[PDB]
RNA sequence: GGCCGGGAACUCAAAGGAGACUGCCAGUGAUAAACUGGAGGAAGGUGGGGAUGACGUCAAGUCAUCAUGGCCCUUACGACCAGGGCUACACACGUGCUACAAUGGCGCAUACAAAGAGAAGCGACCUCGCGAGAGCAAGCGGACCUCAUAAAGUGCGUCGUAGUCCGGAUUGGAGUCUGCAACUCGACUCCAUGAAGUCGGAAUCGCUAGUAAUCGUGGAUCAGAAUGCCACGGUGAAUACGU
């Protein structure tokens, strides 16, 4: 969070992202890492984030950059 | 209390003048343990008052009190299931204490700009026999007179 | 005196009076009056047209009033459309910075409803 | 406390002792100003591959005789209950009941 | 020659040295008006001399530390009384009747478990 | 030169015994010593709950006291320094020697 | 400038001692036990504050600190792991903090404390940053160095009874630090926004003196996270006829 450190990301997620982008097409990518920032090279993909029970699919766009993955998968049910 | 005798605490006299009455007045006026503020207020008020009447501060103060000291009051009794107002005589220390309390209570309720100004206005009205303090004294005496049958 | 589209009082000191603008606080007020070169305790009723124009020039260096309001509204609308946690909080009317909701929260909820 | 919680604690302290110097090195690299700006990225990405249990902040102070995770005192290594028991028996030098 | 007195109050200690002639007071390398800017404090420090007519016959050199304003003032008064008694030894009766020879043994009471202060209890509810 | 001895304990009678012993053993070996100086005592305090469950008043309060003494030797000699370094004291006193 | 040569007198530090017992005087009383006044004395009648909890009562609390009779499960009611929850929100109650202002808010500059903690710890002087902080670096296992600048107070200006130059919830944007890692769900800083509230119905609580009220300071747990809990000093009241 301090700028002299840069952002944070998980290594396994980063490697999978690189493979998918360089190889082109991809089915949804499953992830438990809700603490990772979204980098510009992710746009266009489908990341399925854990929320406790299921995996919620998110189709990344360009306005999401700089968010954490967890903000697009809420954790509680209320009606 | 039930089985006690309580002695009298000693009180220092005022520094500027030398009266214990004025020290008790400062004490009754103070709040939260700030004696300096109370002394400032009282001294300023007495200064602005001495002019308006051309006499010493002590004389102005005494004449102001003599119109608010009460004489008889009413206590409440209930032994037969009904409340009765019984008139009683007031004693000197209580006379002075009640007068001071009423003067300060009336002062705090006015609507002038400064507390010293309110205090001075109230003291002047008292010396002229007008204001809430004198009204309170009159009301107490009226209640006491209306219940003389239960003495 | 008209400054940014509004009328600012005349009997107040300048540093207080300039605060009537939506976008200006005490820090910016002090900074602007320092740049203009006027004392902080001068009534606005004792100023000249040239001095008022200098103050207009100073105030013109910030974002105030309608532009600021549009900026804030767009900022909120972006989240509301995106649909993230904060956006859902915004479009339900509950606290957004993680405060308790078992009790209190009456500034975001309004008075009680039996 | 259960017999598996104490085992968890022993494992934690062991690993923290084992990996002490490597972490200090990596963290000095990441903290130091005027670095290559890719060595920083590398050190950050490597500090998270080590076992989680090797960080000193995953450890919990416990009573040395029972295992209680609450009411701990550092001067004695014990919880309030056992401190009182030993104190009344006379096993803590210099300690006694106080008034003032 | 010098005459000495020690005085104490709430948390304060005062050393008083007194000599003859030309009434002048010095406290912690300063004057009375410079040190104590309260009429009450000044009157307290001055009381014993006004009582025994020696206001303009003695030089006073004083030091004090600990406490606040009122504690220091009281410690000074006690010290002056003791030094004067050392000097003369026949003012004891008058000073005693005035009441300045006694040490005031009032201290701050301690905080206690289950209370909010020395004597103040939390709020009680029957239901 | 000058030698300094610092002594710590939990019991003042024990500490006084040790101090007297050191002073005498220095005086018998021909040296000058500046008597022991008493120094501020340390009071450490603890406060615990005395029930295995809820009750939140009902506490106990404990203390540990630490006593401390200092002794100075001004003019030493070889025999005396050996005499000090070859002395034994009780099983509850802490001794520090500085040269 | 206790700076320096010195002094052992005074503050103070901490070990051994003295002192308060109705001991002395006068009056009342059963030729008593006691009571009410007075002298000397720092203190007078239990001087002030702690610790100290009788035989028993409530089948009162705790098998989740621990120990233990009886029952119950053993490829599972026993292990290991990554994510989530204990932080939810139409509503009802207890305990607190900050206010609703001139005995006050804001700007300048100036007296006076007590008790504590410190080696994977406490971090000076100097430089950079508007600031939270950053870089380099002495000293200290401490009556020596560091944390660490008390605040209310006093002096001089301004505000002029207004939902305010009173109050500081909420929300936008930009940052710092601890930590593998601050979305859910951390503390602090900067610019901006500036809600309710003008003293609170029926009820109801604490306090007899260095007490109530009011102002600041420290510690335990603890990588980080107090308006809670345990301690310390400053200023300093009103009232008790009576049962």
Curated annotation (Swiss-Prot), chain A:
NCBIfam families: rpsS_bact. Part of the 30S ribosomal subunit. Binds S13 and L5 and cross-links to the A site tRNA. GO terms for cellular component: cytoplasm; cytosol; cytosolic small ribosomal subunit. This is Small ribosomal subunit protein uS19. Keywords: Ribonucleoprotein, Ribosomal protein, RNA-binding, rRNA-binding, tRNA-binding. It comes from Escherichia coli (strain K12). HAMAP family: Ribosomal_uS19. In the E.coli 70S ribosome in the initiation state it has been modeled to contact the 23S rRNA of the 50S subunit forming part of bridge B1a; this bridge is broken in the model with bound EF-G. The 23S rRNA contact site in bridge B1a is modeled to differ in different ribosomal states, contacting alternately S13 or S19. In the 3.5 angstroms resolved ribosome structures the contacts between L5, S13 and S19 bridge B1b are different, confirming the dynamic nature of this interaction. Bridge B1a is not visible in the crystallized ribosomes due to 23S rRNA disorder. Belongs to the universal ribosomal protein uS19 family. GO terms for molecular function: rRNA binding; structural constituent of ribosome; tRNA binding. It comes from the Bacteria. GO terms for biological process: cytoplasmic translation; ribosomal small subunit assembly.
Swiss-Prot record, chain B:
One of its GO terms (biological process) is negative regulation of translation. Changing residue 115 to G: Significantly decreases affinity for its own mRNA. Transmembrane segments: none annotated. Keywords: Ribonucleoprotein, Ribosomal protein, RNA-binding, rRNA-binding, tRNA-binding. Coiled coil: none annotated. One of its GO terms (cellular component) is cytosol. One of its GO terms (molecular function) is rRNA binding. It comes from the Bacteria. Belongs to the universal ribosomal protein uS7 family. Part of the 30S ribosomal subunit. Contacts proteins S9 and S11. Cross-links to IF3 and the P and E site tRNAs. The strain K12 sequence is shown. Has been predicted to contact the N-terminal domain of IF-3 based on footprint studies; exactly how IF-3 interacts with the 30S subunit is controversial. One of the primary rRNA binding proteins, it binds directly to 16S rRNA where it nucleates assembly of the head domain of the 30S subunit. Is located at the subunit interface close to the decoding center, where it has been shown to contact mRNA. Has been shown to contact tRNA in both the P and E sites; it probably blocks exit of the E site tRNA. Protein S7 is also a translational repressor protein; it regulates the expression of the str operon members to different degrees by binding to its mRNA. This is Small ribosomal subunit protein uS7. The lineage of its organism: Bacteria, Pseudomonadati, Pseudomonadota, Gammaproteobacteria, Enterobacterales. The chain holds residues 2 to 152 of 179 of the full protein.
Swiss-Prot record, chain D:
PROSITE patterns: RIBOSOMAL_S14 (PS00527). SUPFAM superfamilies: Glucocorticoid receptor-like (DNA-binding domain). InterPro entries: Ribosomal_uS14 (IPR001209), Ribosomal_uS14_bac/plastid (IPR023036), Ribosomal_uS14_CS (IPR018271). Coiled coil: none annotated. The keyword 4Fe-4S does not apply. One of its GO terms (cellular component) is small ribosomal subunit. Keywords: Ribonucleoprotein, Ribosomal protein. Transmembrane segments: none annotated. NCBIfam families: PRK08881.1 (NF006477). Part of the 30S ribosomal subunit. Contacts proteins S3 and S10. This is Small ribosomal subunit protein uS14. It comes from Escherichia coli (strain K12).
From Swiss-Prot, chain F:
SMART domains: Ribosomal_S10. InterPro entries: Ribosomal_uS10, Ribosomal_uS10_CS, Ribosomal_uS10_dom, Ribosomal_uS10_dom_sf. Keywords: Ribonucleoprotein, Ribosomal protein, Ribosome biogenesis, RNA-binding, Transcription, Transcription antitermination, Transcription regulation. SUPFAM superfamilies: Ribosomal protein S10. GO terms for molecular function: structural constituent of ribosome; transcription antitermination factor activity, RNA binding; tRNA binding. Pfam families: Ribosomal_S10. The keyword Nuclease does not apply. Disulfide bonds: none annotated. GO terms for cellular component: cytoplasm; cytosol; cytosolic small ribosomal subunit; small ribosomal subunit; transcription elongation factor complex. GO terms for biological process: cytoplasmic translation; regulation of DNA-templated transcription elongation; ribosome biogenesis; transcription antitermination. Part of the 30S ribosomal subunit. Can also form a heterodimer with the transcription antitermination protein NusB. Binding of S10 to NusB is mutually exclusive with its incorporation into the ribosome. The rRNA transcription and antitermination complex (rrnTAC) consists of RNAP, NusA, NusB, NusE (this protein), NusG, SubB, ribosomal protein S4, DNA and precursor rRNA; S4 is more flexible than other subunits. PANTHER family: 30S RIBOSOMAL PROTEIN S10 FAMILY MEMBER. Belongs to the universal ribosomal protein uS10 family. This is Small ribosomal subunit protein uS10. The lineage of its organism: Bacteria, Pseudomonadati, Pseudomonadota, Gammaproteobacteria, Enterobacterales.
């Amino acid at each position: 969070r301090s700028l002299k450190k840069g952002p944070f990301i998980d290594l396994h997620l980063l490697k999978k992202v690189e493979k998918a982008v360089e190889s082109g097409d991809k089915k949804p990518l499953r992830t438990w890492s809700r603490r990772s920032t979204i980098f510009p090279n992710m746009i266009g993909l489908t990341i399925a984030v854990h929320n406790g029970r299921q995996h919620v699919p998110v189709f990344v766009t360009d306005e999401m950059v700089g968010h954490k993955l967890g903000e697009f998968a809420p954790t509680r049910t209320y009606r | 209390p039930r089985r006690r005798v309580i002695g009298q605490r000693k009180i220092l006299p005022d520094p500027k003048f030398g009266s214990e009455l004025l020290a008790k007045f400062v004490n009754i006026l103070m709040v939260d343990g700030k004696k300096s503020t109370a002394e400032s207020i009282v001294y300023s008020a007495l200064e602005t008052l001495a002019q308006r009447s051309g006499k010493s501060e002590l004389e102005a103060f005494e004449v102001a009190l003599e119109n608010v000291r009460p004489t008889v009051e009413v206590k409440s009794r209930r032994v037969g299931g009904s409340t009765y107002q019984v008139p009683v005589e007031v004693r000197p220390v209580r006379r002075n204490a009640l007068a001071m309390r009423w003067i300060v209570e009336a002062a705090r309720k006015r609507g002038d700009k400064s507390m010293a100004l309110r205090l001075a206005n109230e003291l002047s009205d008292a010396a002229e026999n007008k204001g809430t303090a004198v009204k309170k004294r009159e009301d107490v005496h009226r209640m006491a007179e209306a219940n003389k049958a239960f003495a | 005196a008209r400054i940014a589209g509004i009328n600012i009082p005349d009997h107040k000191h300048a540093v207080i009076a300039l605060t009537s603008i939506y976008g200006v606080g005490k820090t910016r007020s002090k900074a602007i009056l320092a740049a203009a070169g006027i004392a902080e305790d001068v009534k606005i009723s004792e100023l000249s047209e040239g001095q008022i124009d200098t103050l207009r020039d100073e105030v013109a260096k910030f974002v105030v009033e309608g532009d600021l309001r549009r900026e804030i509204s767009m900022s909120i609308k972006r989240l509301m459309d995106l649909g993230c946690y904060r956006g859902l909080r915004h479009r339900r009317g509950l606290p957004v910075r993680g405060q308790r909701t078992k009790t209190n929260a009456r500034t975001r909820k309004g008075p009680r409803k039996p | 406390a259960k017999q598996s919680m104490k085992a968890r604690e022993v494992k934690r302290v062991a690993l923290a002792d084992k990996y002490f110097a490597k972490r200090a090195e990596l963290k000095a690299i990441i903290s130091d100003v005027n670095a290559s700006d890719e060595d920083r990225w590398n050190a950050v990405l490597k500090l998270q591959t080590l076992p989680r249990d090797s960080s000193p902040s995953r450890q919990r102070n416990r009573c040395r005789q029972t295992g209680r995770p609450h009411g701990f005192l550092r001067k004695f290594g014990l919880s309030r209950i056992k401190v009182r028991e030993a104190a009344m028996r006379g096993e803590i030098p210099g300690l006694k009941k106080a008034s003032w | 020659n010098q005459y000495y007195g020690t005085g104490r109050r709430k948390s304060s200690a005062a050393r008083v040295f007194i000599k003859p002639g030309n009434g002048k007071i010095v406290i912690n390398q300063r004057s009375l008006e410079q040190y104590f800017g309260r009429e009450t404090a000044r009157m307290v420090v001055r009381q014993p001399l006004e009582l025994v007519d020696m206001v303009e016959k003695l030089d006073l050199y004083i030091t004090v530390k600990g406490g606040g304003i009122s504690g220091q003032a009281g410690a000074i008064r006690h010290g002056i009384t003791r030094a004067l008694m050392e000097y003369d030894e026949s003012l004891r009766s008058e000073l005693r009747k005035a009441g300045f020879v006694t040490r005031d043994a009032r201290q701050v009471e301690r905080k206690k478990v289950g209370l909010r202060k020395a004597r103040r209890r939390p709020q009680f509810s029957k239901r | 030169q000058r030698i300094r001895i610092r002594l710590k304990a939990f019991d003042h009678r024990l500490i006084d015994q040790a101090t007297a012993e050191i002073v005498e053993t220095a005086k018998r070996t021909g040296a000058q010593v500046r008597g022991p100086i008493p120094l501020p005592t340390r009071k450490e305090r603890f406060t615990v709950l005395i029930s295995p469950h809820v009750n939140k008043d009902a506490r106990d309060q404990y203390e540990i006291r630490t006593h401390l003494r200092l002794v100075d030797i001004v003019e030493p000699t070889e025999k005396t320094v050996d005499a000090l370094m070859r002395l034994d004291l009780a099983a509850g006193v802490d001794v520090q020697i500085s040269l």
